[model samples]
Target: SMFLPPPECPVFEPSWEEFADPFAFIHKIRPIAEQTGICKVRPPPDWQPPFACDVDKLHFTPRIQRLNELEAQTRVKKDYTLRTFGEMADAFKSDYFNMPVHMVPTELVEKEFWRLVSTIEEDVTVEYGADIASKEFGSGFPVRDIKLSPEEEEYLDSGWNLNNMPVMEQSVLAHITADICGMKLPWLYVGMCFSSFCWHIEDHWSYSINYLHWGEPKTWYGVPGYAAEQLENVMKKLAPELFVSQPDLLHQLVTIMNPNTLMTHEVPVYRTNQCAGEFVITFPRAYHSGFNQGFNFAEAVNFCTVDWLPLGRQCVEHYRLLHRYCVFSHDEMICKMASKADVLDVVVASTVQKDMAIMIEDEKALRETVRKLGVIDSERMDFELLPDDERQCVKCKTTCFMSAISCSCKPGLLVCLHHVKELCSCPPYKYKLRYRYTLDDLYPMMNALKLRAE
Candidate 1:
């Protein structure tokens, strides 16, 4: 008797713990692999679907409209590889190739893959090379080195510059792969073949699953973190800051945000007769680098993330507050009020000009002073005016009136009423003087003889 099994590959089965942090779960399998050499794992049978009932019920119509608008706006400035559904089908035609491949939005990548395939197929033979004994399949190809036909060169150089390609396409591809893999991706990066590449451990807070397609085998070294640390310490002692300032260091620091001084293993590979499909998974922060890998044929997808990490919410309240503050701070009247003491004083006086404002009842004295001033503009009369010639000090540039006494305490410490006005305007002086105080106090104390009626 014989039994037939289902033709479809089993859906990935993940455990509750694995879903919490997929990277850690993958690392747990490594020791088992070392003992058994190879094993098959599947997604959790009871795994909750990625989407929820509430999510399904929510109308994506508005969102879809907005997305279309955004897509149109984006396409106006750039070309979309997935221009049509047919192009998308062409890129995903391989059913035997089961590993998750990051995909740009179906609309964009469909167009791009067709363009690449059409151009490559027209002039080049792209059949899988027959070399079973070769380690090339395990490594990768130098896609960039594949000489592009004259037409392909023109298409890429003119029609497919960076702007033509949506920058987020790679990120969206990563999202799709993570969804398919039953994992949450915290970080995803995409680059062309000649772009900077990494071979470090995939471990951070989560396990990393990397899928490399369409490129040469990059060198990889997968050692435990503890071993990498010892090598680093030795290297630092020999090279000091020289190693810290290297270009690789810049790339690593900017892209990989590992604060822990963990050790890493190295992986190395060279371009050879490699296939467009190869993948490697590692624990977090494994050190990796690729060298002399050829042209733009390389594509990679990685999932670096964990569930249970907090979701980022829009800070709408903060944005609204900031906008309000900016508008008020920039008001023209506010600017004018800040510069003029008379304007500010008038505002203060109007609010407290009733009978209750006159605590000392000095109306007669105030009237006499106003009469002597000869009915000048109220704003101008608020402060003592200096004649043009006497406005600036004779020796120094400080402003002073003709009536101000020369410095009695020091030869150069000119005792000007304007200086007294500045002092009285300060917070401490204003508090002490109760807003009604004048410059007479400083004059009486510093120049008693000069204050005599004249």
Candidate 2:
């Protein structure tokens, strides 16, 4: 009567122990495959891997590239609607697009990131994607774009050299690599799909572990490195469907093949509805991708690359390899190397330059207004408004504190506890007054009046 296992089956539980040792982890989960008619296996609970890395030491600095130069070199576009991972994947799989995958550029991203930090001081509601979502959904407060001042730009530029910085600086991939490999190389590749997606292999350099924060659960189907041909066949079979009629399905399919899944050759479909978070780890050179069930999702993708060798020799090796592979022309390689060196030099020099600070006595005056507000006094209590007369509760006949109370019946009147309870039990009042006050309204009044302790 039933074919699939119930959602609560024990097979669904992730085996956490395999995470500590890479080899054991992969070996333990190698049997499951989605297309191969094998049941999916869950990762062990103890299977946790080091993922995040420190980027503060990366000395990332913005370059003072002219606006015109940036506009010419980069494709700057804005989307007011929510962008689906499926849409992003479609672009990635397309031959027409070759630019770097980035949502916000360095300048705008940094400015907006810091602006949100500053606004936190003002008791504003801030959340990841909140600013962008507000612009799209028309909810809460209006999101405003932050424009960088020339002075701020100079200060930022002077502190760090953007020219010499790594392309993947402060990225999740960089962090993960630094954590695992003790090396700080750049991880260039990134993939995304809808809520439920999984992948099979690791990237060119190091392994990756991607974490899903907000989305429906992801379904993963991984094939181990030994099954490379089978994996390729899988891709080949799905390619036409992926590239053609069902682009979204292709996005999901690519995700499930993420390198981490391939390393283990196991399928793990996270019910995103039940678990709000999930992550996958990939070993170096492993292959993978995923597919989604169409639920929109948000995730934090992280991966680490292999360490960087010495720049001088590494650059030479890189050039030779580029020429050998025909990835870049000789002129292009030279130009890129020269530009990279210049950027690096700028960053190093800026780090060495320091400025003197001058403290002003008048700075103390800034707090004088805050000190006079009397908000620090705990003994004093204040109300929203003064009633013209001492009002009596219609139900209890008891006198009510006009300033500190609110009425359910009419405006400009205070209702006692008994009357409030009576109102709650009775039918709803047809007419309610705007003049009624509560603790919420009274706090603002107190602030306005600057109520002080005796």
Top candidate by TM-score? 2
The reply for model 2, stretches above 4 Å from the true place, is 1-80, 83-205, 233-274, 300-302, 305-454
lDDT per residue for candidate 2 within 288-307, as digits (tens), equals: 43333222232322232222
Q: What is the lDDT of residue 80 in candidate 2?
A: 17
- Best-fitting candidate, scored by lDDT: 2
Candidate 1 lowest-lDDT run of ten: 68-77
Number of clashes in every candidate structure?
42, 51
**Model 1, runs deviating above 4 Å:** 1-28, 32-206, 242-275, 296-454
Q: lDDT of each structure?
A: 0.26, 0.28
